[PDB]
């Protein structure tokens, strides 16, 4: 692919999805906690304040070194992010929406251009 | 209320704009030195991370910049539809998550 000689665009997108899935998993596990263990929901909420999901593996590595019970929370998120990605995430729907976004973007850019230059 | 799939799709749309600008820039370096230089200068004062805003600004800068913008738009759709290996990216996502799980585990107890 012209202009790429390190990571492929696929690998780049792949790493972004990985981190995105960590973030989904944290939102998932957080939800499940809110009336199954609000003591643990509060603690997760406290950890999120000072800890960023952005580099998700660094966030998880930090989370499981926080305490033994935080470590158990990390292991839950690891399991949930695996299950979500491999089982629930609608990959082909994602692809379809991206095509629609690109198609609609093309259309809108051209339409607004033509309209405003007249 | 935006779904994960939809959030992921918005990111991929902007990502494909980025890829298309990179592809187009590379081709211009080989096939049109002057146009390469105009794109590069435009790139010095306009962020591709702006996505469609960037394209809209490019379109209106001049007729030469409009040609750049139309080539980028064409390359963006053709790349995403014909060339980008969607199933490979997926296999790579799965592998990243598997390898990450294993490494996080190994490193915590070792």
UniProtKB/Swiss-Prot annotation, chain A:
It is found in: Plastid, Chloroplast. GO terms for molecular function: protein folding chaperone. Induction: Up-regulated by salt and desiccation. Its main location: plastid. Keywords: Carbon dioxide fixation, Chaperone, Chloroplast, Photosynthesis, Plastid, Transit peptide. GO terms for biological process: carbon fixation; chaperone-mediated protein folding; photosynthesis; response to cold; response to salt stress; response to water deprivation; ribulose bisphosphate carboxylase complex assembly. One of its GO terms (cellular component) is chloroplast thylakoid. It comes from the Eukaryota. Chaperone involved in RuBisCO assembly process. Belongs to the RbcX family. Homodimer. Interacts with rbcL, atpB and THI1. This is Chaperonin-like RBCX protein 1, chloroplastic.
């Amino acid at each position: 692919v012209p202009g790429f000689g390190e990571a492929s665009p696929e690998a780049k997108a792949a790493k972004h999805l990985h981190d995105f899935f960590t973030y989904v998993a944290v939102r998932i596990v957080s939800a499940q906690l809110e009336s199954y263990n609000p003591e643990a929901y509060m603690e997760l909420r406290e950890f999120l304040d000072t800890n960023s999901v952005s580099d998700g593996d660094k966030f998880l590595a930090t989370l499981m070194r926080r305490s033994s019970r935080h470590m158990n929370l990390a292991l839950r998120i690891l399991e949930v992010r695996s299950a979500y990605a491999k089982n629930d995430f609608e990959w082909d729907n994602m692809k379809r929406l991206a095509f629609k976004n690109v198609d609609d973007s093309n259309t809108r850019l051209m339409r607004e251009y033509v309209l405003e230059t007249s």
